[PDB]
Protein backbone atom coordinates (compact mmCIF):
# COMPACT_ATOMS: atom_id res chain seq x y z
CA UNK A 1 0.00 0.00 0.00
CA UNK A 2 0.91 3.67 0.32
CA UNK A 3 -1.70 5.99 1.96
CA UNK A 4 -1.12 5.56 5.69
CA UNK A 5 0.67 8.57 7.17
CA UNK A 6 0.04 12.29 6.80
CA UNK A 7 -1.90 14.71 8.99
CA UNK A 8 -1.25 18.43 8.56
CA UNK A 9 1.73 20.03 6.81
CA UNK A 10 2.62 22.85 4.42
CA UNK A 11 5.47 23.29 1.94
CA UNK A 12 5.79 25.67 -1.01
CA UNK A 13 9.35 26.46 -2.10
CA UNK A 14 9.22 29.09 -4.88
CA UNK A 15 11.70 31.74 -6.03
CA UNK A 16 10.03 32.88 -9.23
CA UNK A 17 6.54 32.80 -10.80
CA UNK A 18 6.48 28.99 -10.61
CA UNK A 19 3.07 27.34 -10.95
CA UNK A 20 3.86 24.32 -8.78
CA UNK A 21 2.01 23.35 -5.60
CA UNK A 22 1.85 20.42 -3.18
CA UNK A 23 -1.23 19.17 -1.36
CA UNK A 24 -4.19 20.89 -2.98
CA UNK A 25 -7.55 19.15 -2.46
CA UNK A 26 -8.00 18.06 -6.08
CA UNK A 27 -11.67 17.47 -5.27
CA UNK A 28 -12.15 21.08 -4.15
CA UNK A 29 -9.48 22.23 -6.62
CA UNK A 30 -11.86 21.76 -9.53
CA UNK A 31 -14.32 23.97 -7.66
CA UNK A 32 -11.90 26.90 -7.79
CA UNK A 33 -9.80 26.31 -10.92
CA UNK A 34 -12.90 24.92 -12.60
CA UNK A 35 -14.36 28.37 -12.78
CA UNK A 36 -12.22 29.20 -15.81
CA UNK A 37 -14.21 29.19 -19.04
CA UNK A 38 -11.20 28.55 -21.26
CA UNK A 39 -10.52 25.46 -23.36
CA UNK A 40 -8.99 22.16 -22.33
CA UNK A 41 -5.72 23.99 -22.36
CA UNK A 42 -5.43 25.62 -18.98
CA UNK A 43 -3.24 23.23 -17.02
CA UNK A 44 -1.34 23.41 -13.71
CA UNK A 45 1.46 21.36 -12.11
CA UNK A 46 0.89 20.41 -8.47
CA UNK A 47 0.49 17.19 -6.51
CA UNK A 48 0.40 16.01 -2.96
CA UNK A 49 2.32 16.35 0.25
CA UNK A 50 0.75 13.00 1.15
CA UNK A 51 1.98 10.97 -1.82
CA UNK A 52 5.82 10.86 -1.24
CA UNK A 53 6.28 10.03 -4.91
CA UNK A 54 3.36 11.96 -6.27
CA UNK A 55 3.17 14.44 -9.13
CA UNK A 56 -0.03 15.53 -11.00
CA UNK A 57 -0.68 17.55 -14.10
CA UNK A 58 -3.92 19.49 -13.77
CA UNK A 59 -6.05 20.49 -16.74
CA UNK A 60 -8.88 22.94 -17.31
CA UNK A 61 -11.22 21.46 -19.78
CA UNK A 62 -14.40 23.12 -21.03
CA UNK A 63 -16.51 21.31 -18.65
CA UNK A 64 -14.23 20.64 -15.72
CA UNK A 65 -10.63 20.22 -14.56
CA UNK A 66 -8.60 17.13 -13.60
CA UNK A 67 -5.53 15.84 -11.76
CA UNK A 68 -3.19 13.20 -13.24
CA UNK A 69 -0.91 12.07 -10.38
CA UNK A 70 0.42 8.62 -9.96
CA UNK A 71 4.08 8.34 -10.65
CA UNK A 72 6.92 10.93 -10.56
CA UNK A 73 10.52 10.94 -11.80
CA UNK A 74 11.52 7.35 -11.05
CA UNK A 75 14.67 5.35 -11.75
CA UNK A 76 12.73 3.21 -14.18
CA UNK A 77 11.94 6.22 -16.36
CA UNK A 78 10.93 9.85 -15.92
CA UNK A 79 7.42 11.32 -15.60
CA UNK A 80 5.29 8.24 -15.07
CA UNK A 81 1.71 9.24 -15.79
CA UNK A 82 -1.04 9.26 -18.38
CA UNK A 83 -4.77 10.00 -18.14
CA UNK A 84 -7.99 8.33 -17.04
CA UNK A 85 -7.41 5.85 -19.87
CA UNK A 86 -3.87 6.50 -21.13
CA UNK A 87 -0.34 5.14 -20.71
CA UNK A 88 2.29 7.83 -21.25
CA UNK A 89 4.32 7.33 -18.06
CA UNK A 90 7.42 8.84 -19.74
CA UNK A 91 9.08 12.24 -20.28
CA UNK A 92 6.95 15.35 -19.76
CA UNK A 93 8.73 18.68 -19.22
CA UNK A 94 10.77 18.66 -22.44
CA UNK A 95 7.84 17.08 -24.28
CA UNK A 96 5.35 19.50 -22.77
CA UNK A 97 7.34 22.52 -23.93
CA UNK A 98 7.47 21.58 -27.62
CA UNK A 99 4.36 19.38 -27.70
CA UNK A 100 2.54 22.17 -25.81
CA UNK A 101 1.21 23.00 -29.26
CA UNK A 102 -0.13 19.49 -29.92
CA UNK A 103 0.50 17.14 -26.97
CA UNK A 104 -1.70 14.80 -24.91
CA UNK A 105 -3.61 17.45 -22.97
CA UNK A 106 -6.88 16.04 -21.62
CA UNK A 107 -8.46 12.61 -22.24
CA UNK A 108 -10.76 13.04 -25.38
CA UNK A 109 -10.77 16.84 -25.85
CA UNK A 110 -8.67 19.92 -26.68
CA UNK A 111 -5.25 18.31 -26.23
CA UNK A 112 -3.65 21.73 -26.78
CA UNK A 113 -2.78 23.74 -23.67
CA UNK A 114 -0.73 26.67 -22.32
CA UNK A 115 -1.01 27.85 -18.69
CA UNK A 116 -3.60 28.47 -15.95
CA UNK A 117 -5.43 31.51 -14.57
CA UNK A 118 -5.17 31.59 -10.77
CA UNK A 119 -2.15 33.32 -9.24
CA UNK A 120 -0.39 35.44 -11.86
Amino acid sequence: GSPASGTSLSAAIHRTQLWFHGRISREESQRLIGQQGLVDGLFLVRESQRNPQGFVLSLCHLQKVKHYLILPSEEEGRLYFSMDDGQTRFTDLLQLVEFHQLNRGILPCLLRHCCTRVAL
Binding site: S2, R26, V56, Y68, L69, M83, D84
Partner: peptide, 10 residues
Amino acid sequence: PQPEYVNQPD
Protein backbone atom coordinates in the same frame (compact mmCIF):
# COMPACT_ATOMS: atom_id res chain seq x y z
CA PRO B 1 -12.08 1.59 -6.13
CA GLN B 2 -11.86 4.28 -3.44
CA PRO B 3 -9.53 7.22 -4.33
CA GLU B 4 -9.92 9.45 -7.41
CA TYR B 5 -6.76 10.81 -9.07
CA VAL B 6 -5.94 9.65 -12.64
CA ASN B 7 -3.79 7.18 -14.47
CA GLN B 8 -5.64 5.38 -11.75
CA PRO B 9 -7.39 6.49 -8.56
CA ASP B 10 -3.70 6.97 -7.73
